[PDB]
Amino acid sequence: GSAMGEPDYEVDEDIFRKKRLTIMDLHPGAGKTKRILPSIVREALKRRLRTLILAPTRVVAAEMEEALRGLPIRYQTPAVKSDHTGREIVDLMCHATFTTRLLSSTRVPNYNLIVMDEAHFTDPCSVAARGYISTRVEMGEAAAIFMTATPPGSIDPFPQSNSPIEDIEREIPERSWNTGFDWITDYQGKTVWFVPSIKAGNDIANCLRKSGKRVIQLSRKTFDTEYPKTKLTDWDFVVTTDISEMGANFRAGRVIDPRRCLKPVILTDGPERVILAGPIPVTPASAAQRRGRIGRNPAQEDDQYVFSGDPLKNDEDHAHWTEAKMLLDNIYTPEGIIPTLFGPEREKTQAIDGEFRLRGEQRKTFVELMRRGDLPVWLSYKVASAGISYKDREWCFTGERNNQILEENMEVEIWTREGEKKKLRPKWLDARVYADPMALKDFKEFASGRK
RNA sequence: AGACUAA
């Protein structure tokens, strides 16, 4: 047993048995990170188990280190720095880092125990990782623990909280406003506002700042300097991407959740291509996770979750289900086996077994295009499977007429490393590399041969 | 679009 705040002295021994996959479904804020995780890790250490801990984001990683502080843990994330002497038997990294290590070489330790926090996270690398982990368990090589307040089959956007939550439906601005939304700025407490993009985040944040509001902007690019600022009292608004969807312990009184996002979609009508569809509603799980950022403190009972619209459960057309298979078809166990998807995540699309398996230099190229090229999984797969090498940028120029990239209604031209001038016209179209002007800038760099 | 940045 334990007191409210401390980890339990007693841990069930059956969670450590090879062949056991434990799904731990608790409600948001039930001490999964501050109590449960350190109990598990302390007991893993006493059992001398080679242990892997997985966080979906650097936000969760940061929160885990707070709870695990003092334990001999090798942190493999830029989010945490600590004194490591490479004799640690416990490793901690992000979901996607692990999948990257599995795909690279880089040989991965033979973990006896794997703890995946936020095991519902649908990023393709995270889906692929659960495939690998559930296969290790099934082979009898590991025990694993999947922890999530919103497991597969979650439908409830309004789950249990530690403190009452006032759920309010209101129209929420997706852009700057001049009037008509006084309730946003009249509110006297702290707000966490979820935005689908950094562009929208910048625009919303500037609007609030000119209303005399103190705003912290949180996303992948600003995490390092701005996340520690959220722990101060010094702010009115955190305007955040879903970097903060899970785990975050803001000291807020209100969440604003527009409940919408862009979705990458693979089109099969004509030449295969990726578009950014929407905005469309987020899933019930995302909505519940965002709402879970408040109602966490029993002494503070008037927290609000302000939202717009219903969530949308069906995400079967999302590119992540295909991209997860593209990754997993190229991951192996030391025994040679290609892992299968975690049970509940099978048949999300119709996915001929092994159809994404790449051979030799193609697999290496695939990995290179993702981690050096900064290209999406689908586009990386398409280029690599064509037998194109990483530094061969010819495919950026040889597409059909309709694949010509336009920026400000003008045909994009590229000046190559060798000094040729060529129209940017990729053989394969993935909206993720050209839609946002910043992504286009990066993709132009790649087409040039400067990446 | 968002997340990740190992070894």
Curated annotation (Swiss-Prot):
It comes from Dengue virus type 4 (strain Thailand/0348/1991). The record marks 290, 293 as: Involved in NS3 ATPase and RTPase activities. A motif (DEAH box) lies at residues 117-120. Residues 17-20 are annotated as: Important for RNA-binding. Displays three enzymatic activities: serine protease, NTPase and RNA helicase. NS3 serine protease, in association with NS2B, performs its autocleavage and cleaves the polyprotein at dibasic sites in the cytoplasm: C-prM, NS2A-NS2B, NS2B-NS3, NS3-NS4A, NS4A-2K and NS4B-NS5. NS3 RNA helicase binds RNA and unwinds dsRNA in the 3' to 5' direction. The modification N6-acetyllysine is found at residue 221. This is Serine protease NS3. Forms a heterodimer with NS2B. Interacts with NS4B. Interacts with unphosphorylated RNA-directed RNA polymerase NS5; this interaction stimulates RNA-directed RNA polymerase NS5 guanylyltransferase activity. Interacts with host SHFL.
